[PDB]
Design a protein that fits this description.
Two copies of one chain form a homodimer.
Chain A (H helix, E strand, L loop, with lengths): L3 H15 L4 H8 L3 H8 L8 H11 L3 H4 L9
Helix pairs in contact in A: 2-4
């Protein structure tokens, strides 16, 4: 019912929002361009990549490991 | 000095090897094709995706969260 891009981008938006940031601000600080940002939240995109997730995590001050501590990714 | 694809694929190979599997066997069980497998370990590829990692993790019986419990991904 949800793609990996959807799980990831929704989690990312939750974390961004908890830090009183915006996706655009994170994009600017993480150095991704609007096209990459837009793709993340386009359901029919294969993005985000690990690289993109890593870069955003850097901006957020969290590890990629911690980023993925949510369902379904933290259960087998 | 290492791409994310290199960090990920090297970790994946360590885990596969610890389970006495081969990358080809995991590929067959996880249902990815040789092209996707080859891309994972091609340094100039942007792959693996989260999807591919998730699928392999399933075959390995581990969570994606646990997959990423190694450096650099488990530090900020």
């Amino acid at each position: 019912m949800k793609t990996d891009g959807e799980f990831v981008s929704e989690h990312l938006m939750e974390l961004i929002t908890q830090q009183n940031l915006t996706i655009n601000r994170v994009a600017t600080l993480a150095g991704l361009n609007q096209s990459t940002v837009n793709a993340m939240f386009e359901g029919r995109s294969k993005r985000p990549t690990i690289t993109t997730i890593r870069k955003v995590c850097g901006t957020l001050g969290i590890s990629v490991h911690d980023f993925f501590d949510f369902p379904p990714y933290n259960e087998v």
